């Protein structure tokens, strides 16, 4: 979604430093408001201490800052943050791999639903659309980016993802629960009807198509599960309390105290707490990692591109089962027909990558 | 890719020490430039303090160094680095196991696509090439090492991985998305056509070949996913900010202060911060682990050898379905035909490894 | 169960702060009683020290508080807590994914059990009910929320999940063990009988239905395993001993000592230990995470909604195999019949999400 994969392909001098200059989906963009509020509260307190407090009040503030500073300890924050963010990242990738792709069903429907006639074409196209509909229905239930594009079931119809008859049949089935599973049932019935009409040879080929359907259903279920079962609220609150406890301590504890009073640890007054602000970006930015990935189907820069996926799948799906049904290129003899040990060429820049075969660690390299 | 597996086979005296003398894919090669910049910035600051600053300025620098040194804390860096590098290492191995291997399809196509005639040969060879093409297409999309070898679809054709007719059919199919999935559809269609021509006996055998194809498609999808879905940028920036914050503190904090002033902790002046430089190799090298494996398909020393894999797969693939179709050695009686409990020999060096059968922990060893 | 997924969809200013104002399934609701007892014991001790102890006794208390405070170390608690809570969270999600869903069997039974006559209808409905019964039986064995709804096998019958004849057959089978597996056997027998009556065409389709049944059985087994095999008691006691040891130390160690005596670290008297109470919410709330998820089938706010699942599954199950058996909508040509590269519309708010196809990191974006 914010892909920088090609920038970090090699481990060169500025592989990671270069990324500090990027704004899209960056730490600056996510921390902006929070950082400013921190900056303000800090320098506000700083001026109150330098310009308002009396000599006697300043002595109390200095004693209060020493108290607060002794409680700004990251080690407990690092512990709970690391674990929580690890949990979020785990679910984040699991949710991605749970986005259903048509390609596996697409391959079977394209080759095993017979007929080069309009009905065979309508049959194959309708089967794929039942798959894409099972997906679009669940995606608009879990993704705010998709829902805002299909806010009502009418949008789904007008977008060409569901026919008005299907919508009628959809409404006809009375159920109080999410009907995303309906197209998945239609598919199995239509696949069986297709087999009875002789469009699907065996039951082995039919069950094979039914299996890939069931797999797609399990994908939609996983998406439903992660949307329904949030990370327990108590856990989320714990990590924000811990993080905020730290920044609360820093607000006062990290104040630059009087250099003249010579407090151990506060010998220099820089006015601006460089390292405390660097700690804020670290921990507030670290919390923002979880903050952004806790729901990867939202509208964040790094949230999944669910609407593009829908478009790509629609185009590719139909194309593979229609224009490509039993449509192959001209079979030719391959360029290595009479060559048992082909030696495919290398460009000038890639010849260093033509390596001898790795036989095993145990063998002597001679 | 940089395999030292045989060197670390045994846990001897210098099993790991020996590896500190290796340059290829080493910590020295990856840290070289960064270390020099650190070295320079350090000793530059060191000379400014020893030779330029006035007695009064030196006192401020010493107070500034005590401030910076109090913020060079590795514990928070260790937390975020360990977690981040673990995530990178996790994806690193997942991407490797996502590199498709022909061997499973290779075994089925070689034995279940009938015919010892030129067509049967062309059929089997074309089926394998559709698999290898599905792979090469995705590999050149995710690997810079491969792309620089196949920068254009013409390179793929001229290299013998795609026929010009296939390229024509390829172009004929209008789609704005990556067509790496095309050969995977052709395969299923060609496998079905082969079955209708009587070259594949049952549908059980056909579905079995279609399944191994779908698995290969899922492999290509995983590669696409890891290339598309980068580790969230904010997370990457967080760990570089944390690491750099530490080295910023060390640049000044780890300066050798005046021994005469007798600062607690700074009683000895060695001019060269041995342990601080050793800490740099540790953390900068630890960050380089993630820096190198975050994209294992690049051109790093330890990045995957994707071009060799392509070559090996091409050679082995065709060879197994052509020269090896229904081609077996002469069936003989095995050397242990009349021996129910064979006792295979051992070399002189390996006799210590002939052990009695492990029956279970519960049994008395007598 | 306490779903806030939509609130945390985007990483905005108050994404996580907002959740601190929520009561249901919150840290406040789970810690309430414990916190009050801590508060009381603390201020109780505080008053005894300020108002009861003599000048000589106060000096001992101050020496005792310095001793206790030196043992309030979070680092060892963070270690064991983080690990333990991670184990609980791991099992927590594994148990969720082990809750059986009818949808996969539902799809096969609806399309592969032939007959539009009352028997075909009774056959399909009875097959699904044998599945839902296998589930309801195990759920009421592991979930207190479900058991309190089906305390006796009569409740199961009167609720319409088991017929009185089935209950008679149930009792007839003499076994001292949990009979949740019985309906799962009936299903396989009824599925075979259905095939012999010609209601299930092939064995390929029959084995396919038997496989999805076995999968559901494995789901029930996982639920049984997690209920039977608790997290080892010694481990649970260890983490509570560690946590309580910390709060025991804090009860005395974190007392506000005499400011006049000028103890290093105790220069300011605030009467209320703000940061110690913030540490209590952190660790006591962190322990409550494990405390709540160690049995996700209980009656906690964030415990699974097992009774709703039963209701939803009952409704959807029967509906898909009865009203939807071979019942499809009118096949129409799709809106993109003559459009090879469809461009589904976007709402005004979602047009920014229409992206160009991601081809791969290696390709030049031009």
């Amino acid at each position, epitope marked *: 979604t914010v892909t920088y994969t090609n920038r970090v392909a090699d481990a060169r001098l500025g592989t990671f430093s270069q990324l500090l200059l990027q704004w899209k989906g960056s730490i600056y963009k996510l921390l902006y408001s929070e950082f400013l509020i921190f900056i303000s509260l800090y320098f506000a307190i700083s001026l109150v201490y330098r310009l308002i407090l009396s000599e006697s009040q300043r002595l109390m503030f200095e004693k209060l800052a020493l108290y607060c500073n002794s409680y700004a300890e990251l080690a407990p924050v690092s512990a709970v943050l690391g674990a929580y963010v690890s949990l979020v990242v785990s679910r984040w990738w699991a949710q991605y791999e749970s986005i259903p792709w048509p390609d596996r069903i697409m391959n079977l429907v394209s080759c095993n639903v017979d007929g080069e006639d309009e009905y065979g074409r309508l049959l194959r196209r309708t089967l794929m659309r039942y798959s894409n509909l099972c997906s679009v229905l669940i995606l608009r239930s879990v993704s705010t980016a998709v829902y805002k594009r299909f806010p009502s079931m009418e949008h789904v119809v007008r977008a060409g993802l569901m026919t008005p008859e299907e919508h009628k049949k959809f409404e006809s089935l009375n159920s109080p629960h999410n009907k995303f599973w309906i197209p998945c049932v239609w598919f199995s019935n239509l696949a069986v009807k297709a087999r009875n009409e002789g469009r699907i040879r065996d039951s082995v080929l039919l069950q094979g198509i039914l299996n890939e359907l069931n797999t797609l259903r399990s994908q939609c279920g996983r998406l439903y599960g992660y949307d329904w079962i949030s990370i327990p609220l108590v856990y989320t609150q714990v990590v924000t309390v811990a993080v905020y406890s730290f920044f609360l301590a820093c607000l006062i504890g990290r104040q630059f105290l009087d250099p003249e009073k010579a407090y151990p640890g506060h010998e220099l007054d820089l006015f601006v707490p460089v390292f405390t602000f660097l700690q804020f970006f670290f921990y507030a930015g670290w919390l923002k990692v979880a903050e952004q990935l806790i729901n990867p189907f939202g509208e964040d820069d790094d949230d999944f591109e669910t609407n593009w996926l829908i478009d790509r799948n629609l185009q590719v799906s139909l194309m593979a089962v229609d224009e490509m049904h039993q449509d192959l290129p001209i079979l030719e003899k391959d360029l290595y027909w009479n060559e048992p040990d082909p*030696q495919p*060429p*290398y*460009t*000038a*820049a890639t*010849a*260093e990558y*033509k390596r001898p075969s790795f036989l095993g660690s145990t063998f002597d390299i001679s | 890719t940089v395999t030292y597996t045989n060197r670390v086979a045994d846990a001897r005296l210098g099993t790991f020490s020996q590896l500190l003398l290796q340059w290829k894919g080493s910590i020295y090669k990856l840290l070289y430039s960064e270390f020099l910049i650190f070295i320079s910035l350090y000793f530059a600051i060191s000379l400014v303090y020893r030779l330029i600053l006035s007695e009064s300025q030196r006192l401020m620098f010493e107070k500034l160094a005590l401030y910076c040194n109090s913020y060079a804390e590795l514990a928070p860096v260790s937390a975020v680095l360990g977690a981040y590098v673990s995530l990178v290492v996790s994806r690193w191995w997942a991407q490797y196991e996502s590199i498709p291997w022909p061997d499973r399809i290779m075994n089925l196509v070689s034995c279940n696509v009938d015919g010892e005639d030129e067509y049967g040969r062309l059929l089997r060879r074309t089926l394998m090439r559709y698999s290898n093409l599905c792979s090469v297409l995705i590999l050149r999309s995710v690997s810079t090492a491969v792309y*620089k070898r196949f*920068p*254009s679809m*013409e*390179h793929v054709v*001229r*290299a013998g991985l795609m026929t010009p007719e296939e390229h024509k059919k390829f172009e004929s199919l209008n789609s704005p998305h990556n067509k790496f999935w095309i050969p995977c559809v052709w395969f299923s269609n060609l496998a079905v056509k082969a079955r209708n021509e009587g070259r594949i006996r049952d549908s059980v055998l056909l579905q079995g070949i279609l399944n191994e194809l779908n698995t290969l498609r899922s492999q290509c999808g995983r590669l696409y996913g890891y290339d598309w879905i980068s580790i969230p940028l904010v997370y990457t920036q967080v760990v570089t900010v944390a690491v750099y914050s530490f080295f910023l503190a060390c640049l000044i904090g780890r300066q050798f202060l005046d021994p005469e002033k007798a600062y607690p902790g700074h009683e000895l002046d060695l001019f060269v911060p041995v342990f601080t430089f050793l800490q740099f190799f540790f953390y900068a090298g630890w960050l380089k682990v993630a820096e190198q494996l975050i994209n294992p398909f690049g051109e790093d020393d330890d990045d995957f050898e994707t071009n060799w894999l392509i070559d090996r797969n091409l050679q082995v693939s065709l060879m197994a379905v052509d020269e090896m179709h229904q081609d077996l050695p002469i069936l003989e009686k095995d050397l242990y035909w009349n021996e129910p409990d064979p006792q295979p020999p051992y070399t002189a060096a390996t006799a210590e490894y002939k052990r009695p059968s492990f029956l279970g922990s519960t049994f008395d060893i007598s | 169960t306490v779903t806030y997924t939509n609130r945390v969809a985007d990483a905005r200013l108050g994404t996580f702060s907002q959740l601190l104002l929520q009561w249901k399934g919150s840290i406040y609701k789970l810690l309430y009683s414990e916190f009050l007892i801590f508060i009381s014991l603390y201020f109780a001790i505080s008053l005894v020290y300020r108002l009861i102890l003599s000048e000589s006794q106060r000096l001992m208390f101050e020496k005792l508080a310095l001793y206790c405070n030196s043992y309030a170390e979070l680092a060892p608690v963070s270690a064991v807590l983080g690990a333990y809570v991670s184990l609980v969270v791991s099992r927590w999600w594994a148990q969720y994914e082990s809750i059986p869903w009818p949808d996969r069997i539902m799809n096969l039974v609806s399309c592969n059990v032939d007959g539009e006559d009352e028997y075909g209808r009774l056959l399909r409905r009875t097959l699904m009910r044998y599945s839902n019964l296998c589930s309801v039986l195990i759920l009421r064995s592991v979930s207190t929320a479900v058991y309190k709804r089906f305390p006796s096998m009569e409740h199961v019958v009167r609720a319409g999940l088991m017929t009185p004849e089935e209950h008679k057959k149930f009792e007839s089978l003499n076994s001292p063990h949990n009979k949740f597996w019985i309906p799962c056997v009936w299903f396989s027998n009824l599925a075979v009988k259905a095939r012999n009556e010609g209601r299930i065409r092939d064995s390929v389709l029959l084995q396919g239905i038997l496989n999805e049944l076995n999968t559901l059985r494995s789901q029930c087994g996982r639920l049984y395993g997690y209920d039977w095999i608790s997290i080892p008691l010694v481990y649970t006691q260890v983490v509570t001993v560690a946590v309580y040891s910390f709060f025991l130390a804090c009860l005395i160690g974190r007392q506000f000592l005499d400011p006049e005596k000028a103890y290093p670290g105790h220069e300011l008297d605030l009467f209320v230990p703000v940061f110690t109470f913030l540490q209590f919410f952190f660790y006591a709330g962190w322990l409550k995470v494990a405390e709540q998820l160690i049995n996700p089938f209980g009656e906690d706010d964030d415990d699974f909604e097992t009774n709703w699942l039963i209701d939803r599954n009952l409704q959807v199950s029967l509906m898909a195999v009865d009203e939807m058996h071979q019942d499809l909508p009118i096949l129409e040509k799709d809106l993109y019949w003559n459009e090879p590269d469809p461009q589904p519309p976007y709402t005004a708010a979602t047009a920014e999400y229409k992206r160009p196809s991601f081809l791969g990191s290696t390709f*030049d974006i*031009s």
Partner: antibody, heavy 109, light 106 residues
């Protein structure tokens, strides 16, 4: 049709610098590496270097390290080569060729 | 670097004849060799690539062979057009050095 149109002939005084062009057309500029060859009468063709149009990665010949410079303009589909500290020996015919495991299209020179 | 040694420096033959130019590699270059034809004043043109494969326009009378370190171009049944310059180039690595050349005169 693939066509590599280079700049016109040049005349400079020793020590100066020159920058010749090569405009490609009829194929995707960024998908083929561009090479530069030096042709002197009586000597064999010398390989100066190559350039990756996409990322402007240059790979020169050690023999031309300080003499030649490569860069491209993806927008105008043209490649450039700059020769510095020109001497009498830097006088020759300079080609730009497209690579596809071979040099299948050269410029006029 | 890989050294390309071409021979003969110049061959003289008349129409109808069949000549054979030879390029020898300093080290193994597998099948990575190309043959170019260059007529005085014009820019070179690709004849054979990948050691054996003829390019588009090349007539059947041209054929290449060899592998490893020994390659050869063979022009059977000469024509008037076939008179001019001929050189080889290896394509195994960087820099892709060229051959000395061969002047084919009448």
């Amino acid at each position: 049709q693939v066509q590599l149109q280079q700049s016109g002939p040049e005349l400079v005084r020793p020590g100066a610098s020159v920058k010749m062009s090569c405009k490609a057309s009829g194929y995707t500029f960024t998908n083929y590496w561009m090479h530069w060859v030096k042709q002197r009468p009586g000597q064999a063709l010398e390989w100066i270097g190559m350039i990756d149009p996409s990322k402007s990665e240059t790979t020169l010949n050690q023999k031309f390290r300080g003499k030649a410079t490569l860069n491209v303009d993806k927008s105008s589909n043209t490649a450039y080569m700059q020769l510095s500290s020109l001497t009498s020996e830097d006088s020759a015919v300079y080609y730009c060729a497209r690579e596809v495991y071979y040099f299948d299209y050269w410029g006029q020179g | 670097d890989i050294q390309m040694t071409q021979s003969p420096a110049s061959l003289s033959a008349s129409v109808g004849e069949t000549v054979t130019i030879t390029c020898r590699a300093s080290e193994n270059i597998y099948s990575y060799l190309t043959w170019y034809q260059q007529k005085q004043g014009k820019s070179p043109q690709l004849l054979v690539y990948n050691a054996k494969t003829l390019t588009e326009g090349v007539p059947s009378r041209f054929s290449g062979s060899g592998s490893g370190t020994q390659f050869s171009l063979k022009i059977n049944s000469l024509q008037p057009e076939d008179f001019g310059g001929y050189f080889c180039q290896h394509h195994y690595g960087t820099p892709p050095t060229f051959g000395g050349g061969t002047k084919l005169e009448v």
